[PDB]
Amino acid sequence: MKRNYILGLDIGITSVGYGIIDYETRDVIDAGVRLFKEANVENNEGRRSKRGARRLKRRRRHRIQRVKKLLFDYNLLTDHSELSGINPYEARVKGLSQKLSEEEFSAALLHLAKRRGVHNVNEVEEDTGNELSTKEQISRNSKALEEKYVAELQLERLKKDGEVRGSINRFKTSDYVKEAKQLLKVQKAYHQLDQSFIDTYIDLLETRRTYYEGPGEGSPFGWKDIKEWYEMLMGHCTYFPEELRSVKYAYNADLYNALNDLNNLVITRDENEKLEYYEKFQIIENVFKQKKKPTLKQIAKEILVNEEDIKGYRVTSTGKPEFTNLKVYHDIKDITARKEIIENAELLDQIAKILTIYQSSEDIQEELTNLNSELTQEEIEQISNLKGYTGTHNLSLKAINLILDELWHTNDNQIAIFNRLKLVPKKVDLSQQKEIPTTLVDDFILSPVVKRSFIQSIKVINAIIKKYGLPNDIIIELAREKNSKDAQKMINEMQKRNRQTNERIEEIIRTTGKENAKYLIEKIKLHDMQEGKCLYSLEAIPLEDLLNNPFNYEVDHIIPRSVSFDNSFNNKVLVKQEENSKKGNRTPFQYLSSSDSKISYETFKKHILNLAKGKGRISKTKKEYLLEERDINRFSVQKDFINRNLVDTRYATRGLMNLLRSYFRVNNLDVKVKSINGGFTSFLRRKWKFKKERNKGYKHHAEDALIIANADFIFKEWKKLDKAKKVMENEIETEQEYKEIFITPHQIKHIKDFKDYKYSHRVDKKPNRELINDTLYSTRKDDKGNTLIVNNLNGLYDKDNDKLKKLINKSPEKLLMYHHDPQTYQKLKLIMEQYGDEKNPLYKYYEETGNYLTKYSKKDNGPVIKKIKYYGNKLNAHLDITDDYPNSRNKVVKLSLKPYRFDVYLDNGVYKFVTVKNLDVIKKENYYEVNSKCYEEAKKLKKISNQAEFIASFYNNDLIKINGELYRVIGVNNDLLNRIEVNMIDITYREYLENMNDKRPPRIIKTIASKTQSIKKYSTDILGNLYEVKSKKHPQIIKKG
Amino acid sequence: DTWIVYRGRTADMNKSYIAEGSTYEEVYNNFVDKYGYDVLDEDIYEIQLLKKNGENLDDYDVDSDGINNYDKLDEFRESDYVDLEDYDYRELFENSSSQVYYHEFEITHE
RNA sequence: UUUCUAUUUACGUUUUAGUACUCUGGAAACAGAAUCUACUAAAACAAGGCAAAAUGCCGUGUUUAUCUCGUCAACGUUGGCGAGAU
Secondary structure, three states: OOOEEEEEEOOOEEEEEEEEEEEEOOOOEEEEEEEEEOOOOHHHHHHHHHHHHHHHHHHHHHHHHHHHHHHOOOHOOOOOOOOOOHHHHHHHHHHHHOOOHHHHHHHHHHHHHHOOOOOOOHHHOOOOOOOOHHHHHHHHHHOOOOOOOOOHHHHHHHHHOOOOOOOOOOOOOHHHHHHHHHHHHHHHHOOOOHHHHHHHHHHHHOOOOOOOOOOOOOOOOOOOOOHHHHHHOOOOOOOOOOOOOOOOOOHHHHHHHHHHHHHHOOOOOOOOOOOOHHHHHHHHHHHHHHOOOOOOOHHHHHOOOOOOHEEEOEOOOOOOOOOOOOOOHHHHHHHOHHHHHHHHHHHHHHHHHHHOOOHHHHHHHHHHHHHHOOOOOOHHHHHOOOOOOOOOOEOOOOHHHHHHHHHHHHHHHHHHHHHHHHHOOOOOOOOOOOOOOOHHHHOOOOOOHHHHHHHHHHHHHHHHHHHHHOOOOEEEEOOOOOOOHHHHHHHHHHHHHHHHHHHHHHHHHHHHOOOOHHHHHHHHHHHHHHEOOOOOOEEOOHHHHHHHHHEEEEEEEEHHHHHHHHOHHEEEEEEEEHHHHHHHHOOHHHHHHHOOOOOOOHHHHHHHHHHHHHHOOHHHHHHHHHOOOOOOOOOHHHHHHHHHHOOOOOOOHHHHHHHHHHHHHOOOOOOOOEEEOHHHHHHHHOOOOOOOOOHHHHHHHHHHHHHHHHHHHHHOOOOOOHHHHHHHHHOOHHHHHHHHHOOOOOOHHHHOOOOOEEEEEOOOOOOOOOOOOOOOOEEEOOOOOEEEEOOOEEEOOOOOOHHHHHHHHHHHEEEEEHHHHHHHHHHHHHOOOHHHOOOHHEEEEEEEOOOOEEEOOOOOOOOOOOOOOEOEEEEEEEEOOOOOOOOOOEEEOOOOOOOEEEOOOOOOEEEEEEEEHHHHHEEEEEEEEOHHHHHHHHHHOOOOOOOOOEEEEOOOOOEEOOOOOEEEEEEEEEEEOOOOEEEEOOOHHHHOOOOOOOOOOOOOOOOOOOOOOOEEEEEEEEOOOEEEEEOOOOOOOOOOO | EEEEEEEEOOOOOEEEEEEEEEHHHHHHHHHHHHHHHHHOOOOOHHHHHHHHHHHOOHHHOOOOOOOHHHHHHHHHHOOOOOOOOOOOOOHHHHHHOOOOOOEEEEEEEO
C-alpha cells in the first residue's frame, strides 16, 4: 500500500541487495538480494573471436568456390578431371615456365587462392607466443625472396627442411600476386585465356574487405556505406542526440581534461586558491605547449611559488604526480612546428579523428590529402605513422566546447557544471516511460560487470516501486571491487598484510615479555609509522612505555569527524592526552600556530614532509590532512571533505546517480537519491559490531544493504549533519559527539534478528547457449568390442611433461604403439629405463644426444616423433559428426553435450525426466523450436508412455522441490543414470561444507529415478517472493527468442 | 608468495580461458568457479583422487562421462582417502583435453 | 571510465587420399598386411538454418519468474502490448 520507506541498495559484482526501512520507526518492511552469474568480458570475446573465425572460413570457402566456378567457365577445370594426385608446390614451380596440364594448372590456381597471405604488414592482430613476430617474419622472408618467387622458396624448404607448414610460412600478398601473374603470363600462351580472366583471377586472389566496409548485404552487424560507418563506430551522443560522439585523444577533449586538472589544483597564495582565466591561459600555453610531459615542479617554477603549497591533484600508482598532457599537440610539434597547423583547433581535431578511426596508414594519408588544409605532402607521410591514438567513444565535441568555455571563465569542476547546466540524457524520452528504462545503461561506458549490475539494480527498483509504492529516498552503494580477478588479488594482498602485522606483533611479544600487545595492535601500528614521535610535540616515544602505560597515549583524529567523515588509520595518530585535550575539534594548522603546542608549525611541516618521503610511513592523504591550512568552517571546504570521503566519485556510480536523478526530475517525483562511499559502510558495520562472520551465505549482501538505508535515517534525525545531507543528496563537533551520533545501537538489533531474507536467482532460458565442447577426438575399436577415445600425448620433448614416463611404467599397452608398431616401443622403453631418474627422460636424452626419439628404421632415416597417441577411456555420450567426414574407417565424436533443459513426467506413479539437450533446439529465423523428432526419440529412450502426465519443465536456476527440500538446478549431470545437480538456494554448498568443516565433494547431485516422492516447481520474482508455479500441460516448443 | 596464472586455449586457438591463484589448488578452484565445472574433462578431480589412493579406475567404470558407478565412488569417499598434494592439480588441468586442449602455466615468484 | 564492433594472416583438433615408415609372402616385380609415426593435398571445424554465382548471410553475447486476462503482431502457438493474479 502507501507506506513511507527508505530504500537501500548494495550493488555488488555478483549480487544486488535491497532493503526497506520504515521512515518513522526504523522498521524493516522487506529485505532481499537478487543474484546473477558474474558477467565476464571473456564470453563476449568468445562469441566475437569465433564470429571472426566463421567469417574467415566462409570467405576462404567462397573464394575457393568462386575460383572453381571461374575455371569451369574456361574449361580448365571440369567435374571429370581428377585433382587428387597433383602436387601443388611442384606444379607452381613447373608452370613458372614450361607448360602446365589442365589439372596441374587448376590445382595451382586453387592452391594460391586457398592461401593469399597478409596485405597490411602491421594489420595482423595476434600474440607473439610463436617467438617470431609477424613483421619480422615477413622481413626475413622478403630478405630471402629477392630473386626467388614464393613457390621456389616453399619447394626449397620442403626438400631441405622436409616441412612447409608452420610459423615459417607467413608471407605477404604482393609476392603471391607477383607469382600468380608471372605463372599466368606463361600459361596463357598455351591455353585459351583472356585478359578479363587474368584480371578476374588476380582480383579474386588479392581482394579483401577493408575494416570500413564490413560484412555484405543483409547482415545485422553491417552498414551501407562510410557515413553509416562513422555513425556506427561513433554513436549518437546521449547529451545531444543528433550530434555524434568525438574521439578522446582529440585536442579539444585533451584541453578539457587538462583544464579539469588545472581547475582542481589548489595553490596557497595571496590570490585565490583556484587559478583564474588569465593565469590559466598562461599556464596552459607555457607548460602544456612547451614541454611534452608536464610536472608539478614546472608549474611551481612558472608561477614562481612554492611547490609545497600545491594540493589536490591526481597521482599515479607509484606516487609520481600526474598531469594529463596534450599528446596530439606535442606529437604535431615533434614533426612540424609551423604556426598555421598548431593554432587551428578544428584541423587538430580532424587529424585526431582520422588517426583514431583509420587504422591503416595508407587510408590516413589519403584522408588528410582529401582534407584541404595547409599540410604539405612530405609532412603527411610522417604524420601518418603516429600511434597510440585508440579511444573511440568520448563526450561530444559540441558539448565539449560548451564545457570548455565555462571552465576557462570560472574555476568550477565537471560535476557541478553538469548540475548547473542540468544536462539530461536525451536518447530516450524519460517523460513517456512508465518505469526507469534499462536502455540508458547501455550508453555510459561501463565494464560489462557494472552494466549487468546496473540493469539488475534498475529492475529491482522498478519491482519495489511497483510493489510498495514510490520510495522517499534511495541510497546506492557500488562495491569497490571492479571484477572477481580483483576480489581475489585484494583478498590475497590483505591476507599478506595481516600476516606481516601479526609477525610484528609476535616479534614484539617475545621482546616485551607481556601480552598487552594483544589489545594494543592499533597503537603499535601507529607508533612505528610515527617512528615513536609525537607528531604534535616532536618528543620521542619509547615503544615499551606504550605497552606499560597505554593510557599515556591516545589515538587522536587529525581532522574532526563532523567534517572529515574519515575514520581510517590515515586520520589517526598517537598523541599525549594533554596534546589531544588542548587540540580540541580543530585543525593542526591553527593549533601549531597557537602557543599551546611545544613545537612551531614550520618545523612540524618540515618534519612531516621529510618523514612522509622516508620509509613510506606517511600516506599521501595523511600529510594533506596534517597540513590542511584551509579553514574547515568554509562551506566549500566541508563540501570537498564530504565528496572525498563520503560521496562516491567513480564514473560508474555518478552515471547511475545522474540517470536516476534525471528520471525522477523529468517525471516530477520528489525522490532523493544519494550515494555512500565503500569505506563508510565498513566503518558502520564495525562500530555496530555486526561483523561476526562473512560465510553465512548471501544474506551478507542483504544485511549491508539494510545498514546503507539506515544511514539515511541517521542523516535526518540530527540537524548537525543535516546540511551535509543536502550536499550529499544533491556545526563543528567533537569526536565524542560523533560517537554519540553514530555508535548508538538502538533499533539496530532488527538487522540482527530479521531471518526472512528472501533470495532470488536469475533464470537463464537463453537458447543456443553452447552446444558441444570443441575437440574432435577420434576413436578406435578395441578387442572387447567397445570404442575408445584416442587422446594424443603432445610436447613430449618439453622438460616438465612426464606423462609418457608415467604411462610407460604403469600401462604400456595403452600407447597405440605397443601393438600397431612394436619395435618403436622397444626404442622408447630402452630410453626410458636408462634415463629414468629425470622427471622427463626424453628431455635428458635430448640434452646429451641432441636427437629427438626417431621412429625405428633399418636405415635410421625415420621421421621425428612429437605426438604419440594413446587409448584413454571409453565412449558414453557423443555428438557423432562422422557423417561430415567421408568414408571414415573409425568413428569421429565430440563429448559433453551441454543440456538445455529437462522435463519431468509422472508415469505410473514414478517420476522420470527427459533431457532436452541444447543440440535439439534448431533455429529457424527469429523463433527457436525444439526438434520434434529428436525430442520424441529422447522421450522413448526413457521408457515413457504416451499418456504420462506432464509435471514441469526446468531450465537453469529454476527452483525445484524434491521430497520437500528446495534446491536450484544447475543442470543435469548424467541423463542415463537420471542424476540432476542442485546447489542450495541460500548458501553455495561449498560454503555450507566449510561452516561444518565437512570434506564431502562440492556439488550436491540428487537422483529423480526412484524413491522421489515429489518434484514440484517453485519460482521467485526479481524481488524474491517464492510462488509455487503451476505450469502448462504441453512442454514449451517455440521460444520467441 | 607466488602467483600462478593458467592460460588455456581451446583447440582452435580462438576462445581463451584464463584463471589465476596462489597455489595450484587455487588455480583449479577458480577455474571451476569462473568458467564452470565441465570446461575440464568430466569428473577429473575424482579420477585423480581415486588414482592417487591406488584404486583400479576400471572397476568404477571410468567413461568419457567419468565415474559412472556413483554407488562405489561414494564408498571410497567414506574411507579416509589420501588427499591431493597441490602439485597434482597441475596434472588435473593437463589431463583434460575436452575443451582446454592447449594448457600453458606461468609461475611468477615475487 | 575501455565497452561494443570491424577486416586479415598463420597456425591448430580430425578424417580420407597420396608419398615415406614397419612387416610378411618373396629373388621380388610387386602383392599385400598394419593404419603406427612424419610430411602433403583436399575436405569438415560448435548441431544446423537461409540464400542463390553474390568483393555473399546468420549460429557460443547482452536482456528472462510462471500463470493469466483481454489488445495487437508474428503466425495454433509465440510475440509484443497493456491489466491483473499467483
